[PDB]
Design a protein around this ligand. Sequence first.
Ligand SMILES: [K+]
Ligand SMILES: [K+]
Ligand SMILES: [K+]
Ligand SMILES: [K+]
Ligand SMILES: [K+]
Ligand SMILES: [K+]
Ligand SMILES: [K+]
Ligand SMILES: [K+]
Ligand SMILES: [K+]
Ligand SMILES: [Mg+2]
Ligand SMILES: [Mg+2]
Ligand SMILES: [Mg+2]
Ligand SMILES: [Mg+2]
Ligand SMILES: [Mg+2]
Ligand SMILES: [Mg+2]
Ligand SMILES: [Mg+2]
Ligand SMILES: [Mg+2]
Ligand SMILES: [Mg+2]
Ligand SMILES: [Mg+2]
Ligand SMILES: [Mg+2]
Ligand SMILES: [Mg+2]
Ligand SMILES: [Mg+2]
Ligand SMILES: [Mg+2]
Ligand SMILES: [Mg+2]
Ligand SMILES: [Mg+2]
Ligand SMILES: [Mg+2]
Ligand SMILES: [Mg+2]
Ligand SMILES: [Mg+2]
Ligand SMILES: [Mg+2]
Ligand SMILES: [Mg+2]
Ligand SMILES: [Mg+2]
Ligand SMILES: [Mg+2]
Ligand SMILES: [Mg+2]
Ligand SMILES: [Mg+2]
Ligand SMILES: [Mg+2]
Ligand SMILES: [Mg+2]
Ligand SMILES: [Mg+2]
Ligand SMILES: [Mg+2]
Ligand SMILES: [Mg+2]
Ligand SMILES: [Mg+2]
Ligand SMILES: [Mg+2]
Ligand SMILES: [Mg+2]
Ligand SMILES: [Mg+2]
Ligand SMILES: [Mg+2]
Ligand SMILES: [Mg+2]
Ligand SMILES: [Mg+2]
Ligand SMILES: [Mg+2]
Ligand SMILES: [Mg+2]
Ligand code: NA
Ligand code: NA
Ligand code: NA
Ligand code: NA
Ligand code: NA
Lengths: 209, 141, 64, 114
Amino acid sequence: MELSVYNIKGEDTGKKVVLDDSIFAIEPNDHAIYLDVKQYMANQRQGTHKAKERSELSGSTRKLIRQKGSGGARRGDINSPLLSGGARVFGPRPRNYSFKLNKKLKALARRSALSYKAKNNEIIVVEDFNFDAPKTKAFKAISAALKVGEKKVLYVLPEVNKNVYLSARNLPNTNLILANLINTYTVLASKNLVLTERSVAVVNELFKA
Amino acid sequence: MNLSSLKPAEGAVKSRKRIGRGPGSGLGGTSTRGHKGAKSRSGYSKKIGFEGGQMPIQRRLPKFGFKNINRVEYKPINLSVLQTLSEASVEDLIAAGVSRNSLVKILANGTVTTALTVEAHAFSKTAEEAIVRAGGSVVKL
Amino acid sequence: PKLKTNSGAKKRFALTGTGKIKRKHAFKSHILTKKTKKQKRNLTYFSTVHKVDENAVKQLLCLR
Amino acid sequence: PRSVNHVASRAKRKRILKLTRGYFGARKNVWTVAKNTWEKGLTYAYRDRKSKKRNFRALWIQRINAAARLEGMSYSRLMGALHANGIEINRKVLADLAMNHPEAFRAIVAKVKN
RNA sequence: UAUAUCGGUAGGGGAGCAUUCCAGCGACGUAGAAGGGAAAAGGGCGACUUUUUCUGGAGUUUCUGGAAAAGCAAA
RNA sequence: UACCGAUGGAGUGAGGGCAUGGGUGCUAAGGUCCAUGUCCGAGAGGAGAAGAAUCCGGACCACCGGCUAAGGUCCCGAAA
RNA sequence: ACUGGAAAGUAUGGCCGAAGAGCAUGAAAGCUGCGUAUCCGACAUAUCCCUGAGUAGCGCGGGACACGAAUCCUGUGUGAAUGGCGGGGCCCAUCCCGUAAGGCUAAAUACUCCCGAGAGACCGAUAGUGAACCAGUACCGUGAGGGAAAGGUGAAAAGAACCUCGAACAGAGGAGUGCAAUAGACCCUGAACCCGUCUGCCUACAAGCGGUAGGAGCGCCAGGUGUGACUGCGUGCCUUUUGCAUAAUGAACCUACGAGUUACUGUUUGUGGCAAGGUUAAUUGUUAGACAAGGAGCCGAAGCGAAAGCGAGUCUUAAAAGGGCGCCAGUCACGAGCAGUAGACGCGAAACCAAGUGAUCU
RNA sequence: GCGGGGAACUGAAACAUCUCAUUACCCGUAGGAGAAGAAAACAAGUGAUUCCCUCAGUAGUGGCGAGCGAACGGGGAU
RNA sequence: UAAGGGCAGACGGUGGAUGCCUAGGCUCUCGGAGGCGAAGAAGGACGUGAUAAGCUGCGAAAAGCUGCGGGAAUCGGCACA
Ligand SMILES: [K+]
Ligand SMILES: [K+]
Ligand SMILES: [K+]
Ligand SMILES: [K+]
Ligand SMILES: [K+]
Ligand SMILES: [K+]
Ligand SMILES: [K+]
Ligand SMILES: [K+]
Ligand SMILES: [K+]
Ligand SMILES: [Mg+2]
Ligand SMILES: [Mg+2]
Ligand SMILES: [Mg+2]
Ligand SMILES: [Mg+2]
Ligand SMILES: [Mg+2]
Ligand SMILES: [Mg+2]
Ligand SMILES: [Mg+2]
Ligand SMILES: [Mg+2]
Ligand SMILES: [Mg+2]
Ligand SMILES: [Mg+2]
Ligand SMILES: [Mg+2]
Ligand SMILES: [Mg+2]
Ligand SMILES: [Mg+2]
Ligand SMILES: [Mg+2]
Ligand SMILES: [Mg+2]
Ligand SMILES: [Mg+2]
Ligand SMILES: [Mg+2]
Ligand SMILES: [Mg+2]
Ligand SMILES: [Mg+2]
Ligand SMILES: [Mg+2]
Ligand SMILES: [Mg+2]
Ligand SMILES: [Mg+2]
Ligand SMILES: [Mg+2]
Ligand SMILES: [Mg+2]
Ligand SMILES: [Mg+2]
Ligand SMILES: [Mg+2]
Ligand SMILES: [Mg+2]
Ligand SMILES: [Mg+2]
Ligand SMILES: [Mg+2]
Ligand SMILES: [Mg+2]
Ligand SMILES: [Mg+2]
Ligand SMILES: [Mg+2]
Ligand SMILES: [Mg+2]
Ligand SMILES: [Mg+2]
Ligand SMILES: [Mg+2]
Ligand SMILES: [Mg+2]
Ligand SMILES: [Mg+2]
Ligand SMILES: [Mg+2]
Ligand SMILES: [Mg+2]
Ligand code: NA
Ligand code: NA
Ligand code: NA
Ligand code: NA
Ligand code: NA
C-alpha cells in the first residue's frame, strides 16, 4: 500500500511511503491471532500458588481413636481432609504456563494483526523526531496534531530515543515500542498505530513474507 | 477482531469432562466406574502384560534373533528423484538440497533417461545398468 | 517420566513394514520326534500377532 | 484462584423453601426434610394430572346417568342412541346441559327417544 | 416441509447454567454497591435470570475470550 | 431397516420368575443344574382387595375431548 | 457550583508532568499530606646412572560399578618387573592407546536460618502457617510428646452530664453526643436451625410417609392473596441387591467444611501452521517478557532377512510366485478423551521397621 | 557437601533371588560452596574435571520376571 | 367454647452465616551474606519504671550512660493512664 507522511505539526509533507503488501494486505488469520494472544498472556503469568496437602501438614501421624468399639466413625490421623483444619485435597501447585507455538504461526499472526490495522485504517506514518530535553507537553502536542490523543495509541520507533521515551512515559493512553520487537498483542491492544519512516523501513525489511 | 472480540476457530476448543458432580450431568454417583471390584477403587492400575494369572503372551512366545552392532544401513535414493534433481544438473552427489553426513545407496525404481555422472557410496546392479544405458557413470566412493 | 519398554516384549516382537507385529510360533523347542513334520514347519514360520492381542503387545512395546 | 459460591448455593435452597410453605412441622422449613417432601409431591402431581381426566369423565357420566333416568332412559341406552344417530356432543357438554339447561337436555333426549 | 422417532440402571455421546479471578470493550454507585427480608415477572426446557420495595452503608457489573481451590443430602 | 472393516470410551462377567424339553431330588421345595423363548432386572399405566417378572399394555409435555384392551356393568365403585 | 454528616464524587473552568506509582485524608485526589520522577548528600566505621613395593599381579571370601560373578575396592594368604609395565568385556598372538603404585588447583554446579528490595489471572479469619489476637500459649501427659479457640463501635471517644423506676445501672425508659445508639462497649452487616408475641382462618366423632389433585365457607387487598369444611389418589429418602414400606445399611437439625487434581511420557481425536519436508532443545545477542539467532537431535523419505547382505524387491530353495512380508503426505503445535509413573477419587485397618521416652503404677 | 553404619512396610497380584533403597533414620566432620580434576583415558579419531540438552528407555542387565538402565559421539555453559 | 394445637403474615429473641475489609500467611525473583562462642554463645533465671508488671527494651550505670554526624519541636515503648 501507499501512505502519505505527516510532520510532527500534523501537516501533510507530500512524501509517501510504500508498505509491504505481504505484510499489510494479507487475509488475516483469526485463529492465529487467537493463539498468539493466548500465548502472550500465558507467558506473562507467574504461577506462584500453593496449598498444603496431607503430607505437608504439621500434625502428627498418630491414630486419633482406636479402630473399634468407640461407637463413632473410624479415624486415622488429624491431617485428614474430612476434619476441620485438615488437608487441602487437589489444591493449586506451582506451575509454568508457557507453551510452544510454531515460529511461522507467530509470524502469520503478526502479519494478520498488521493487515487488520491497515485495512481498518488506523496506521499513521509520521516523520522521525527528536527532543533536546524531555518534555511531556511536546509529545502531547504531537499526539494532538496527529489526532490520536483520545483513544489508545502505539508509537513505533526505530531505536531507543531516550528523550522521546521519557516524554511519553507519563501519558496514560500512550505506548511506545521498538520496530524489531513488534508483537501481535501489542499491535492489537491499541486503537491507533503510529509509525516513522525508519520504523516502516525496518518493519518491511524484517517481517516480510 | 481485537482483544475485545477474540474467537477461536469453530471446534478448536472443547470443554473438559467433570465427573462426580450430580445426577443431571450423567457422570455423578459412582462416577463412570461401575459398582465394585478392583477397578472401582482409588489407586487401581492395570498391570501391563497381566492376564489374570494365565501365562501372558510375552512369556508364552520365545525370544528370537539378534541385532548386529556394526550394521551399515544406507539411505535409499531412487532414479526418479535423481532425474527430478537433474531437471533443475549433470553432476549429482550434492544431496544436501536429503541426508546429513550419511551413506547413500542409489536404487532403480524410476528411470534416469539422462547423461549423468553420479557419486554415491553404493549402487544396485539394476541402477548401474540403467544409468549406463541412459549414458552415465558411477563413482562408487 | 517417559514410558519404559518391556524387555521381554522387546526381545520377542518386531515391527513389519505396514505396522504389523512379527512373532515366532511357540510350541517347538524340545519334544519333536512325536510331533508332525508339517506341524513343525508351520511352527517354524513367522506369524503375526492376533488383532485381539494387539494394543496389548503395543502397550508392552510402548505403542511402537 | 479460590471459588466458593456461597450466595448461589444458599439462594437455591431459599428458592425451593419458598415452595414448601404450608407443610406440617419440619417438612416446611428443615431443608433436607422439606426437599424430600417436595419431590415426592412432584411425582404425585405428575400422576394426578393424568388421574384428573378420568375423575372428571366419571363425574360427567354420573350426572348424565341421573338426568337420563329422570327422562326415562339409562346412560348406556342414551349413549348408544346418540352414537347411532351420530350426535357428537361430548360428555362434558351433556353433563353441563343436564345440570344447568334441563330443557336442552330434554330436547336432546327427545331427538333420539324414537 | 414431510415422515419417522423421543421408558430407562451400569455405561457412551451432545449442548448449556452458575461460581472466583484475568485481558479487552463498555457501564453503574452516598440522588445509595455488595450482602440480608418481602413481592412480581421470565426461560424450546432447565441449571438460573431480571425488576420493585424495606434493611444496609461501600463497592459492583455487561459482552467476548482466558484460567480454575468451579456446585453436597447421606461417608 | 442398521449388518460388517477399522479405530476412541465403556460397563458386565452374584442374576431371577414364568412357559416348554430334560437331568437331579421323593414326577418334594419360592430346591438345584442345562437348553429354547419371554418378562423383571433397567418398565411406569389398567384388571386381579392388597402381589417384581400371571392377564392387558411400552410413559416427549399439556388438555375439564373421543375410541378401545384385559376385565367388567346391584351398592361401596365407572357402566344393563 | 450541586448532592451530602463529611467531596477526593458529578458539572464547569485552569495548571504540572523526566512526577497520571502508592498510601492516608469524614466517599473514589496528578495539583490536601506523606510521597513519586529527577538531582544533590558522609565526621566516622565497614565492603569492593634415576623413574613412587608388601605395591602391579595371583588364590579364597565378599563389595561397588546400569549389571544379580570386564574395569575398580579388599578381610585373609601370597607376590614381580625396571627399556620395561597397564588397558582395549574373560584367554592367546598382532595392532593401537597410555605411563600406576606422590600432591595441589579457579569457573561453569547445589542451597537459604539471615539481610535488602521486589512480584503474583495465590489465601482472606472453620481460608491462608498450628499460630492475623494472650501461640508452640491455654490445656493434656511421669516423660518423650501432643496441641487449641480467639480479628471488625465510630470519621473522631465526641464511650451517654442530668432525670425516672429500682436496694442496686441488675436492667430499662428518657435526655444529650453522633449521619446513625435497632452504631452503647459480646458494639459493621446480622441468614438458618431453634424460641416467642400479636393478627387472620381452621380445629375437641376423629385413624396410616402428612403430600398431591379437586373444592365450599370465612378473611384481607381488584382479580390477586391467607386459611381450608368435605372428596379422590398416595407404604419417606439413600445405599446394597435376583428382589427392600421393609423388622437390611445410614442420618438429631441447621450453617460452614468435605472427595478424578497436577506433572511427565505415550496414544487417538477436533482444529490449525508449513509441506517433500516438518520442527528446534540446551543456550546466545539486543532491550528488557519481546524480537532475532541456535539444525545438535527427532520424525518422515524402502523394504525384506536372525544376520552377512540384497534391494521393489527380498526370505525360503538345486530351482520354480510354490509360499511369507513388502512396493504396485508427513510433521510440529493448541484443545479434548484415554493409559502408565507419581499418595493419583476420599476416608478406614490389623500390622512391619527405625530412633528415642518410661519401673513416681506394678 | 563429604564420610561411617543402615531398615521395613511395599512391588513381584503368595515369596526367598530381585525391589522398595546404596532411601528413612542414627553418627562424624568441612566450606562459602564442597566433591571431582590434568590420562598406566576413551575409542577403533578425540584429548583434565563439573553442570545442561541430546544420544536413549537405546546397548546391556534381570526367578531374562517385576524391574533396573549406561557410555561413545554431537550441541552448549565454563 | 377454644384447654391446647395447625398454617400464613408481621415483628422480636438467640446464634454468628454471608458481604465488605485486613499485612497475617503462601509461592517465588533479584542482589547480598552464609555463621555465633573461653574477650564466655545459643537458650534461660532473676531483676530493672513515679505508681503491680503481661509483653518490649535494658542489666546493680538496669524503658538506660558517652562521642561524632543528621535533623528541628516535641518527648518520656505497647496492653483505649
Ligand atoms: K447418590
Ligand atoms: K498357575
Ligand atoms: K467481589
Ligand atoms: K442361569
Ligand atoms: K455502625
Ligand atoms: K463503616
Ligand atoms: K436477628
Ligand atoms: K391432606
Ligand atoms: K442388622
Ligand atoms: Mg506413622
Ligand atoms: Mg489448612
Ligand atoms: Mg478441584
Ligand atoms: Mg447413566
Ligand atoms: Mg467393575
Ligand atoms: Mg458403592
Ligand atoms: Mg458385584
Ligand atoms: Mg487408600
Ligand atoms: Mg384416558
Ligand atoms: Mg415411548
Ligand atoms: Mg430418554
Ligand atoms: Mg435504600
Ligand atoms: Mg469445591
Ligand atoms: Mg453446603
Ligand atoms: Mg467371576
Ligand atoms: Mg457367574
Ligand atoms: Mg430358584
Ligand atoms: Mg443390578
Ligand atoms: Mg424389559
Ligand atoms: Mg365406548
Ligand atoms: Mg356406578
Ligand atoms: Mg496525593
Ligand atoms: Mg487458622
Ligand atoms: Mg448486684
Ligand atoms: Mg439497623
Ligand atoms: Mg450488630
Ligand atoms: Mg361414630
Ligand atoms: Mg367436630
Ligand atoms: Mg440376599
Ligand atoms: Mg415394594
Ligand atoms: Mg453392611
Ligand atoms: Mg441410625
Ligand atoms: Mg431405614
Ligand atoms: Mg441426612
Ligand atoms: Mg451431616
Ligand atoms: Mg508381594
Ligand atoms: Mg394460634
Ligand atoms: Mg429473625
Ligand atoms: Mg557496675
Ligand atoms: Na456429555
Ligand atoms: Na463510607
Ligand atoms: Na441509660
Ligand atoms: Na444416630
Ligand atoms: Na391456640
